[PDB]
Amino acid sequence: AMENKIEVNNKDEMNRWFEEFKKGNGLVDTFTNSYSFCESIPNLDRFVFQMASATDDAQKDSIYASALVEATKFCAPIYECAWVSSTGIVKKGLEWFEKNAGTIKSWDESYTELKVDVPKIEQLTGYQQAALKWRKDIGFRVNANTAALSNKVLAEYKVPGEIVMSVKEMLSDMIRRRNLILNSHEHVDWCREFVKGKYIMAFNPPWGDINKSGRSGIALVATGLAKLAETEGKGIFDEAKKTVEALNGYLDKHKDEVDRASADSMITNLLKHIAKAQELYKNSSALRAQSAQIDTAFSSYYWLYKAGVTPETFPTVSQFLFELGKQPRGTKKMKKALLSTPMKWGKKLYELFADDSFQQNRIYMHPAVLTAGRISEMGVCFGTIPVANPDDAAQGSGHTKSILNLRTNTETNNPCAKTIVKLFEVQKTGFNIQDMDIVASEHLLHQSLVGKQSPFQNAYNVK
């Protein structure tokens, strides 16, 4: 039968369930934080030799897909994975959404927009907050592996020698990437016309004072300018500086019809305001970057909601994901299956892909947007265990973020970092990392470095 065979509603009902299961399967934690089917550290060494013999960039995908399955097939944290796919959490998880449309409104409303363009900062933060709330109202956390983290920094991070050479490349790259990044409407509309080069606007702002105190409690010039940079960009600040320079030129050319005291109090201000705006913009990129991380559990339940999934038909999604983790199909075929499936959720889900939709950089993609890859995000949540026939988890379905369950402590030689880095090597010798917008191995490593020990923890607050 196709019913959710994991009927659990509370931690003890889950502890009880996990008990019977473990007494039937050979779960271990010799290499995993949470009990798993992992009997040995994954060996991706051959996947490199293969990638080096790939003729077409199409089979590099396969080799890569294969390396990926090899690393996660038997690393899934069954206890926490089951909880996430339990009848209680599945019902609560989906229903929370039926009663919280308002909370997810910003980003949820503009999904079509987020589906092609960079989200506004309010939508990002609205999502991160929504995520934190949903885990709270749903009683998601049953332990650290399902907890929302409070700040953490490296106590000790031991690196197996073998990966030492490559790790640096990753870090050298990651930091290279970081630096690369670094390099009532009237206040906006005014700073829109002004930044073009119309300096005489300075003489007559709608409110009459360049320093107008400002509603926000900050000069309307600095706030309006920043909001503008949000829609038009940092280049706006250079445009803003150029206008004041031209204005510097004008007053100078007519120094005699100009009041030198008033001219200086005004030009000094505009710089204080542009500078202010620059500080705010910087703070905003910092924030946007912190809010870029997708909450695996929350987003996955979100896509479930939209796809019209219901507690009764969830097992089929679990089967679907389980089989993809078992047999790396290729993106084109999977979509083909979603289109084909008689289940209504097949096409609804399909309608969620910004795969070809996204005009800009996927790096700037909103954490609630679904793509072929982000599918692997749902896989870890419900693919590791085919809910209808749980014992079939023995076979093993590899889903990318199961690696975080790889033990990382020194006594065991950080099998988690070691296998992550081996991946980067597979990827590094197959494609150009300088060329790629996103490197999966880099994110995982960042997440592990930050201290994630499970695919189900939320790290919004760490930094």
Q: What is the resolution of this structure in A?
A: 2.8
Q: What is the dihedral of CA 314, 319, 322, 324, to 10 degrees?
A: -110
d(CA 258, CA 265) in angstroms, rounded, equals: 12
What backbone phi and psi angles, to 5 degrees, belong to 111?
-50, -40
Name the β-bridge partners of 370: 353
Residue type, 199: Y
Token pair 């919280």: residue: 100
State how far the alpha carbon of 316 is from the alpha carbons of 442, 453, 455, in Å. 32, 28, 22
Residue type, 373: G
Per-residue 3-state assignment (H helix, E strand, C coil) for the chain: CCCCCCCCCCHHHHHHHHHHHHCCCCCECCCECCCECCCCCCCCHHHHHHHCCCCCHHHHHHHHHHHHHHHHCCCCCHHHHHHHCCHHHHHHHHHHHHCCCCCCHHHHHCHHHHCCCCCCHHHHHHHHHHHHHHHHHHCCCCCHHHCEEECCCCCCCCCCHHHHHHHHHHHHHHHHHHHHHHCCCHHHHHHHHHCCCCHHHHHCCCCCCCCCCCCCCCCHHHHHHHHHHHHHCCHHHHHHHHHHHHHHHHHHHCCCCCCHHHHHHHHHHHHHHHHHHHHHHHHHHHHHHHCCCCCHHHHHHHHHHHCCCCCCCHHHHHHHHHHHHHCCCCHHHHHHHHHHCCCCHHHHHHCCECCCCCCCCHHHCCCCCECCCCHHHHHHHHCCCCCCCHHHHHCCCCCHHHHHHECCCHHHCCHHHHHHHHHHHHHHCCCCCCCCCCCHHHHHHHHHHHCCCCCCCEEEECC
Domain boundaries defined on the chain: 1-183+294-463, 184-293
50: left (phi over 0), alpha (psi -120 to 50) or beta: alpha
CA-nearest of 47, 49, 28 to 37 is: 28
Residue type, 439: V
Residue 267 tokens, joined: 């030009």
Q: By the 8 A CB rule, do 87 and 9 touch?
A: yes
CA-nearest of 433, 135, 78, 57 to 298 is: 135
Residue type, 17: W
Residue 142 tokens, joined: 């049953």
Residue 338 tokens, joined: 């979603």
358: left (phi over 0), alpha (psi -120 to 50) or beta: beta
CA-nearest of 324, 377, 328 to 352 is: 377
State how far the alpha carbon of 249 is from the alpha carbons of 60, 198, 252, 257, in Å. 59, 13, 5, 14
- What count of Cα atoms within 13 Å lies in the side-chain half-sphere of residue 278? 14
d(CA 72, CA 87) in angstroms, rounded, equals: 25
d(CA 419, CA 397) in angstroms, rounded, equals: 17
Contacts of 145 (CB under 8 A, 6+ apart): 33, 34, 77, 79, 80, 453, 454, 456, 457
Q: The CATH number of 184-293 is which of 3.10.310.30, 1.10.150.20, 3.40.30.10, 1.20.58.1110?
A: 1.20.58.1110
d(CA 336, CA 350) in angstroms, rounded, equals: 9
Angle between helix 235-253 and helix 260-290 axes, rounded to 10 deg: 180
Rg (CA), the chain: 26
Name the β-bridge partners of 28: 36
Residue 26 tokens, joined: 């050979």
What backbone phi and psi angles, to 5 degrees, belong to 247?
-70, -35
b/e map 64-88, b = 16+ CB within 10 Å: bbbbbbbbbbbbbbbbbbbbbbbbb
d(CA 89, CA 277) in angstroms, rounded, equals: 44
Contacts of 208 (CB under 8 A, 6+ apart): none
Residue type, 397: S
CA-nearest of 40, 42, 62 to 53 is: 62
d(CA 117, CA 320) in angstroms, rounded, equals: 29
d(CA 401, CA 452) in angstroms, rounded, equals: 11
Token pair 């949000």: residue: 230
How many other C-beta atoms lie within 10 A of the C-beta of residue 182? 9
Contacts of 343 (CB under 8 A, 6+ apart): 313, 316
d(CA 332, CA 323) in angstroms, rounded, equals: 16
d(CA 71, CA 162) in angstroms, rounded, equals: 17
d(CA 90, CA 256) in angstroms, rounded, equals: 76
d(CA 195, CA 199) in angstroms, rounded, equals: 8
Residue type, 300: S
Please tell me the total number of residues recorded for the chain in this structure.
463
Residue 29 tokens, joined: 């934690």
Name the β-bridge partners of 397: none
Burial of 170 (0-12, 13-18, 19+ CB in 10 A): buried
How many other C-beta atoms lie within 10 A of the C-beta of residue 221? 27
